[PDB]
Design an enzyme around this catalytic site. Structure first.
Site, PDB file in Angstrom:
ATOM      1  N   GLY A 160     -29.573  30.017  -3.690  1.00  0.00           N
ATOM      2  CA  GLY A 160     -29.660  28.580  -3.826  1.00  0.00           C
ATOM      3  C   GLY A 160     -28.475  27.813  -3.302  1.00  0.00           C
ATOM      4  CB  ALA A 161     -25.235  28.986  -2.033  1.00  0.00           C
ATOM      5  N   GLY A 162     -27.183  27.590  -0.204  1.00  0.00           N
ATOM      6  CA  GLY A 162     -27.499  26.836   0.999  1.00  0.00           C
ATOM      7  C   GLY A 162     -28.331  25.594   0.776  1.00  0.00           C
ATOM      8  CG  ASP A 163     -32.247  26.184  -0.337  1.00  0.00           C
ATOM      9  OD1 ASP A 163     -31.925  26.453   0.839  1.00  0.00           O
ATOM     10  OD2 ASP A 163     -33.177  26.768  -0.925  1.00  0.00           O
TER      11      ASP A 163
HETATM   12  N1  LIG Z   1     -39.623  30.137  -1.034  1.00  0.00           N
HETATM   13  C1  LIG Z   1     -38.985  31.049  -0.304  1.00  0.00           C
HETATM   14  C2  LIG Z   1     -39.573  31.882   0.546  1.00  0.00           C
HETATM   15  N2  LIG Z   1     -38.606  32.624   1.079  1.00  0.00           N
HETATM   16  C3  LIG Z   1     -37.443  32.242   0.556  1.00  0.00           C
HETATM   17  N3  LIG Z   1     -37.670  31.257  -0.309  1.00  0.00           N
HETATM   18  C4  LIG Z   1     -36.652  30.523  -1.097  1.00  0.00           C
HETATM   19  O1  LIG Z   1     -35.377  30.420  -0.448  1.00  0.00           O
HETATM   20  C5  LIG Z   1     -34.582  29.786  -1.461  1.00  0.00           C
HETATM   21  C6  LIG Z   1     -33.096  29.933  -1.124  1.00  0.00           C
HETATM   22  O2  LIG Z   1     -32.788  29.183   0.054  1.00  0.00           O
HETATM   23  C7  LIG Z   1     -34.918  30.572  -2.731  1.00  0.00           C
HETATM   24  O3  LIG Z   1     -35.093  29.678  -3.832  1.00  0.00           O
HETATM   25  C8  LIG Z   1     -36.260  31.225  -2.397  1.00  0.00           C
HETATM   26  O4  LIG Z   1     -37.222  31.025  -3.437  1.00  0.00           O
HETATM   27  K   LIG Z   2     -27.977  30.324  -8.313  1.00  0.00           K
END
Ligand SMILES: Nc1cncn1[C@@H]1O[C@H](CO)[C@@H](O)[C@H]1O
Ligand SMILES: [K+]
Ligand SMILES: [K+]
Ligand SMILES: [K+]
Ligand SMILES: [K+]
Lengths: 299, 298
Positions: A238-241
């Site tokens: 979740g760091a990047g997001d």
């Molecule tokens: N939804 C999804 C499909 N492949 C990866 N993800 C999401 O990437 C996010 C991190 O950037 C995670 O929350 C993961 O669910």
């Molecule tokens: K986290």
């Protein structure tokens, strides 16, 4: 200004103890949207979900965090993506997220922001919703932040990735990428040797995230570094997001962006990226203003 | 003698605190195998699983219970079946559906082979089951076909009868529920269909009846076996438990006769019951101690 996020919103299952999973909202686009929303920014999520548990569950979460769900369609025929965090095991194969289409798109206003990543480009419908979306937002006078989120693994043919990335960046106003993804992209080994992959691909402004190091603002006035706060890794997931969220939250604060604003933005991004890894969940640790500064200064 | 179990094994996530699920071992073949094992019987599980957190979880459970996993091939290109009970599914191209004849061990005489309708659903593994049944019979082995009805899982409900029919042909003993004898024939009264499988090539059929015990159908007559009166809490995993206690008993000899048969069903009913009185599913499968404490208590 409103920040439109389009893409995936899943239900990440994080192993608590070897005999029990933890249920936490997930998905790049989702996370990014909940991030921007938590910081009091105005954000709308555009996408598709199943009219199933995960679907309504996730939809509720969006509402609890102040994210506008007016353009989040739930389909009792599709199955909302669920996944097991480890690496990422993707239980739900096609994933209801991949069904977004150009019609699910909303009217864009001037100066708004449009967000999407590689993820949303993976499958049929959704891919057109993203590129059509990006194009429209640009025509409207808005901005686009393309975050190359490389999850190749879930792509049918890794042959397309470069092309979509390429015309994706053409459409972008700002591109965000990791050191890691750069190499993987244009067969590199050390990213610097390719820290222009995107620029030399149509994006006049690219941001490169780097571990707990910070980022790298690449505009024509030059390359700029911003150190990341001293983190205490609990769950990188979740760091990047979180980084993109704090980034978009800052840019939406004005109508035109510059190095000045970009830096304040990147400073914010790094901060958020740092924080979000202090918990066990893509968005558990996403900061609220009251929390954002207690950290900012504290570091 | 060894009891070979082949088929489904998947993880079941059950809710609990506001935001958390609980990994529960599940799957017909799995349960059946855990049952026979957790009764001091020698059992080997044959099948496919994903090399994800899930698959390994399940694989460990198998080992924790004494089930031989030498032929439980784990894979990184497959996806271990996981369901979230609110009985929802998220993995459809399957996973344990990929087991093939190449995954079958060598069979020895008097050995027992088990499978159900479930393992017959998807065609990547349906061959492993039928090929397996055939080989076990050739080896001087035995086959216990448990028609485990689940028309939901089937796409083409047109295939069901045929596979079932071909299954009874190979099987030595067939196990079916009253309810199932109806879905197959249609008859509203199972007593009408008690010879359904018998006409399909099965010399001996064991009919599950729940609280009402079992009804054995062999060439020389029918013999009713009533089940111990109990709570009747949650009836889940009951059948798989019934089959386990059934196979555990038959593996005890080399050639089953009247007495072993009689006892086996007694054992089955017992196990099926215990399955009921408790909640969960495999969390109702008894150990060699309580089965007695139970029997010698009713
Ligand atoms: N939804 C999804 C499909 N492949 C990866 N993800 C999401 O990437 C996010 C991190 O950037 C995670 O929350 C993961 O669910
Ligand atoms: K986290
Ligand atoms: K561009
Ligand atoms: K037969
Ligand atoms: K039960």
């Amino acid at each position: 200004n409103k920040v439109w996020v389009i893409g995936d919103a899943s239900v990440d299952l994080v192993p608590e103890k070897q005999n029990s999973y933890l249920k936490c909202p997930g998905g790049a686009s989702a996370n990014v949207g909940v991030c921007v929303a938590r910081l009091g920014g105005e954000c709308g999520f555009i996408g598709c979900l199943g009219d199933d548990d995960a679907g309504r569950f996730l939809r509720q979460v969006f509402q609890d965090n102040g994210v506008d769900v007016t353009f989040l369609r739930l389909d009792a025929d599709l199955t909302s993506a669920v996944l097991i965090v480890n690496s990422f095991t993707y239980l739900v194969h096609p994933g209801a997220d991949t069904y977004v289409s150009p019609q699910d798109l909303p009217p864009f206003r001037q100066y708004e922001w449009f967000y999407f990543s590689s993820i949303g480009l993976t499958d049929r419908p959704a891919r057109e919703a993203c590129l059509e979306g990006a194009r429209r937002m640009r025509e409207a006078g808005g901005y686009v932040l393309f975050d190359v989120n490389l999850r190749s693994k879930m792509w049918g043919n890794t042959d397309e990735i470069p092309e979509l990335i390429a015309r994706s960046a053409a459409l972008a106003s700002i591109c965000k990428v990791s050191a890691d993804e750069l190499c993987q992209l244009s067969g590199a080994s050390h990213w610097q040797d390719a820290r222009y992959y995107l620029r030399d691909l149509g994006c006049d402004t690219t941001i490169i995230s780097l571990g707990a190091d910070g980022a790298l603002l690449i505009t024509a006035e030059g390359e700029f570094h911003f150190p990341a706060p001293r983190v205490d890794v609990v769950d990188t997931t979740g760091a990047g997001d979180a980084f993109v969220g704090g980034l978009l939250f800052t840019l939406s604060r004005a109508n035109c962006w510059d190095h000045a604003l970009l830096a304040e933005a990147i400073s914010n991004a790094n901060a958020c990226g740092a924080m979000a890894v202090t918990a066990k969940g893509a968005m558990t640790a996403l900061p609220f203003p009251d929390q954002l500064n207690t950290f900012l200064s504290s570091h």
